[PDB]
Design a protein around this ligand. Structure first.
Ligand SMILES: Nc1ncnc2c1ncn2[C@@H]1O[C@H](COP(=O)(O)OP(=O)(O)OP(=O)(O)O)[C@@H](O)[C@H]1O
Ligand SMILES: Nc1ncnc2c1ncn2[C@@H]1O[C@H](COP(=O)(O)OP(=O)(O)OP(=O)(O)O)[C@@H](O)[C@H]1O
Ligand SMILES: [Ca+2]
Ligand SMILES: [Zn+2]
Ligand SMILES: [Zn+2]
Lengths: 694, 146, 49, 48
């Protein structure tokens, strides 16, 4: 593996048809017999690992101990029609058959799977690199075919990305994707986060901020994968382990608990449908259930208690599953604003930014980067701004002891961490906890769950308060959420039209109060009339209540103007009210709703079209790549796959800096400097080498 | 077949075969596709309308019961909201079909201690149920056309 | 897919499909790796005929 | 109609240079090319 790594280093910055790549191919051809022997060593054991797990092999396996005789092994392998005689003999020799010629195939298969994995992967990387940079050499296709099984086995882990390198050219980078990383990226919650991020950037993003938003998404995704790994499941100590088990159980089943709470709300309301009010106990009235079963009276109490419990568990699951991500995002953006902007060193937000003003409480806390990975952001800000603003003043702002930096640099102290609640009491950072609770209580989802709590608790005061939990379908069902978004999209417009309707109704009220008062008698009695427009407030209420809801306007309700000196004026009044209020304004409201529907639909269509027509990374459209058949599909799956950029970032973070290659070190340095020029922008490997490749 | 055979049991079962134009005529098929394109959305809005009407029913049953007398007789009243199921049926049956919402059907709140609460009740019912939700349904149909 | 299991071993599975030798082709492709007799039992083939 | 007018105005500004008329596609060959062209090269404020 080390020798192959040296060769791959020789291929750094290697152009297509480069002399070093051609020399490498010549060296491999010069040693064709040995390269074929190595590739055969790998492919025999790769094939054997799956063969021993096959039903055809298990048919030959007959010993109850789980072992197989050498002759039975021989007749099983030639039945597979995948090895030759010498290869079967060599496998027999490699099998550690005992004196009884009994083979433990389970361990025989796994003996070389782990030791040979890294070298197999690097051989795959080397062959892929040589094939893609020397594409018109027939001598290399033989090696590629002989390593078909190796390349197939390592295809899901052979991650490739393209970057704009230090040589001002597009370079193609090969690295390893781990099984855990791919499995975690394929989780449905991560897929949903990716979809939401893509929608956000493509819909309401700019190209200048795109790569930075993408890298922020990658960082949040890494943190989410860590949280999922933590919550995943395969007297103080016992209580702590059971508490973490319980919290993880709640976190894993948060959505199931949410669904259960919704189902319980439906059951409670169904029971509530049977309520009945009577004067007789089961001048005050009495509310009770009216039924013959006799069971839903206690069933309602049981369901109410269970519902309150489930909602409480939902809040705990939320602040054990999502609050870490909220705090992580906020701490990360605060740290980057401190370091790369000097937000509280230079600009000092002007009291109109509540977020920035609340973040002042966490600057000097001892535990400010609790969720953010960079625990040295304070040190970095000091080293960057202490010269110009004052080291002591920066240290006072960030709550640093300038004395302890030296001793921490010198040596590491190992004190006694006593496992006592008494000793833990004053370890709490009260100011940081206040800041964190402010951030939590200002979060929409947490506020929703807290309101769900409050309504559930009020449900025990009065069982009808459980009707409010029926609104939970507005967020539980994505279709209903979209439908209500088709209302909330133009909410400001709707409120403005309602206000304008109020104003026009006020004008009509003014005109009526001045002139048409005699027509507003709403009493069939003759001696005690009920005049609705002898007071301006009463007239305005009458209008806003009956005129708007009347199909034909106010004229439907007020008296007939036939045979009056003001007949024509009143008919003009009625017709204009009907047209402006009933027709035009309600039409405006309904048109706002329909236009919100259309706007949402065209947003979704535009996002899908943008993804299917341009590459999310380079920006080159599908038209160029489709010059080669399936060109855009290959470009978006292999060359510029964004999942592979995510995987590359995790690979860099996990890899040791002393083991970084040249290209990896370049990308890593540029990433730490927050410079995104390594992303291919409008250029690609296929475009740069158009003439050599074609 | 089954409807034709039932037509011999009762000749009016032949009325069902008139629906055959839905598939026979491509124009009618497209027009009905302009309905079925967003069927899931339509059913969801109908369910949401049911839920909001249930909430209004809950509020009415708790507070505005005295206004739901639907009997012109004086000695045997017909109260539609003395039972929650009866009140919910009354709402889903008459309030939605009324042009001005439930306030068209229920009694006049003039000169009552709960007048303002009841007018807020009626106006909000008219706006959310009659205006916004039916507008959503019609907009779904028009958007399917487009 | 669960309903299509009933037609695998029928003698007349490709009645409308033109390829009457799909069973033979599947046997020649997968019998080595999964078992010729097991494939023949799945597809209702007589290996003797 | 009003909504599509606003969308068209925004799209035209974000896709073509107000002065030269060359679209953003050409300038985006260089990274941030259109942003630099509209801020430094052909900024209309600079013509004013
Ligand atoms: N740089 C890019 N990386 C990945 N996909 C891209 C890129 N540019 C454009 N796309 C488009 O993004 C689309 C969405 O990805 P795709 O559907 O293939 O992913 P998936 O993981 O198979 O599933 P899903 O349908 O949930 O996205 C692809 O059809 C592809 O054409
Ligand atoms: N020749 C041009 N000069 C300036 N802007 C141009 C030109 N051609 C196109 N544009 C586009 O005009 C848009 C509007 O300018 P921009 O938003 O950057 O200005 P601003 O002063 O920062 O604020 P505002 O958002 O109020 O316009 C820019 O996003 C830019 O892409
Ligand atoms: Ca090194
Ligand atoms: Zn690309
Ligand atoms: Zn220009």
């Amino acid at each position: 593996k080390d020798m192959v790594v040296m060769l791959l280093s020789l291929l750094e910055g290697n152009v297509v048809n480069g002399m070093i790549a051609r020399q490498m191919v010549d060296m491999l051809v010069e040693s064709s017999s040995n390269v074929e022997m190595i590739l055969k060593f790998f492919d025999m054991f790769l094939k054997l690992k799956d063969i021993v797990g096959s039903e055809a092999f298990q048919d030959y396996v007959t010993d109850p101990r789980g072992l197989i005789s050498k002759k039975d092994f021989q007749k099983a392998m030639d039945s597979q029609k995948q090895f030759t005689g010498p290869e079967i003999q060599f496998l027999l020799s490699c099998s550690e058959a005992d004196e009884n010629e009994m083979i433990n195939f389970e361990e025989f298969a796994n003996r070389f799977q782990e030791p040979a994995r890294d070298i197999g992967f690097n051989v795959a990387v080397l062959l892929t690199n040589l094939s893609e940079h020397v594409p018109h050499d027939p001598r290399l296709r033989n090696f590629l075919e002989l390593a078909e099984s190796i390349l197939e086995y390592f295809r899901p882990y052979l991650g490739r990305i393209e970057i704009m390198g230090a040589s001002r050219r597009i370079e193609r980078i090969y690295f390893e994707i781990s099984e855990t990383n791919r499995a975690q990226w394929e989780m449905p919650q991560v897929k949903e986060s990716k979809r939401q991020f893509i929608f956000d950037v493509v819909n309401e993003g700019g190209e200048a901020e795109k790569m930075e938003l993408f890298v922020s998404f990658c960082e949040d995704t890494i943190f989410e994968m860590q949280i999922a790994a933590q919550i995943s499941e395969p007297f103080w100590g016992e209580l702590e382990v059971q508490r973490v088990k319980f919290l993880n159980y709640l976190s894993r089943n948060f959505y199931t608990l949410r669904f259960l709470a919704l189902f319980l709300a439906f059951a409670i309301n169904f029971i509530l449908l049977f309520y009945k009010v009577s004067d007789s106990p089961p001048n005050m009235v009495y509310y009770f259930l009216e039924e013959s079963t006799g069971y839903m009276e206690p069933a309602l109490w049981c369901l109410s208690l269970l519902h309150t419990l489930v909602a409480f568990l939902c809040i705990i699951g939320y602040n054990c599953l999502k609050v870490p991500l909220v705090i992580f995002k906020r701490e990360k953006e605060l740290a980057r604003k401190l370091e790369f902007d000097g937000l509280y060193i230079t600009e000092q937000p002007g009291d109109d930014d509540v977020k920035g003003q609340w973040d002042r409480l966490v600057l000097n806390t001892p535990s400010f980067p609790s969720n953010y990975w960079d625990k040295f952001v304070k040190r970095k800000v000091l080293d960057k701004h202490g010269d110009i603003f004052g080291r002591e003043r920066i240290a006072e702002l960030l709550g640093m002891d300038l004395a302890s930096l030296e001793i921490t640099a010198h040596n590491e102290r190992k004190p006694d961490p006593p496992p006592g609640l008494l000793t833990w009491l004053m370890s709490i950072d009260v100011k940081y906890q206040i800041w964190k609770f402010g951030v939590i209580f200002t979060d929409n989802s947490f506020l929703y769950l807290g309101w769900y709590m409050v309504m559930s608790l009020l449900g025990h005061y009065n069982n009808f308060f459980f009707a409010a939990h029926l609104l939970d379908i507005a967020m539980g069902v994505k279709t209903l959420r979209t439908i209500l978004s088709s209302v909330t999209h133009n909410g400001k417009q709707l409120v403005m039209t309602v206000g304008l309707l109020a104003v026009v109704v006020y004008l009509y009220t003014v005109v009526a109060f001045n002139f048409f008062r005699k027509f507003y008698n709403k009493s069939e009695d003759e001696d005690e009339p009920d005049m609705k427009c002898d007071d301006m407030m009463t007239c305005y209420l009458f209008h806003m209540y009956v005129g708007v809801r009347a199909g034909g306007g106010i004229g439907d309700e007020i008296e007939d103007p036939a045979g009056d000196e003001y007949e024509l004026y009143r008919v003009v009044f009625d017709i204009t009210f009907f047209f402006f209020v009933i027709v035009i304004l309600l039409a405006i409201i309904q048109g706002l709703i329909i236009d919100a529907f259309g706007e949402l639909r065209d947003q979704q269509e535009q996002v899908k079209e943008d993804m299917e027509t341009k590459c999310f990374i380079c920006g080159i459209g599908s038209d160029y790549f489709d010059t080669t058949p399936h060109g855009f599909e290959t470009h978006t799956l292999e060359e510029h796959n964004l999942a592979n950029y995510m995987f590359f970032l995790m690979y860099l973070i996990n890899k040791d800096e002393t083991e970084h290659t040249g290209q990896e070190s370049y990308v890593w340095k540029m990433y730490q400097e927050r410079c995104w020029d390594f992303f291919p922008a409008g250029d690609c490997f296929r475009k740069q080498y158009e003439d050599q490749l074609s």
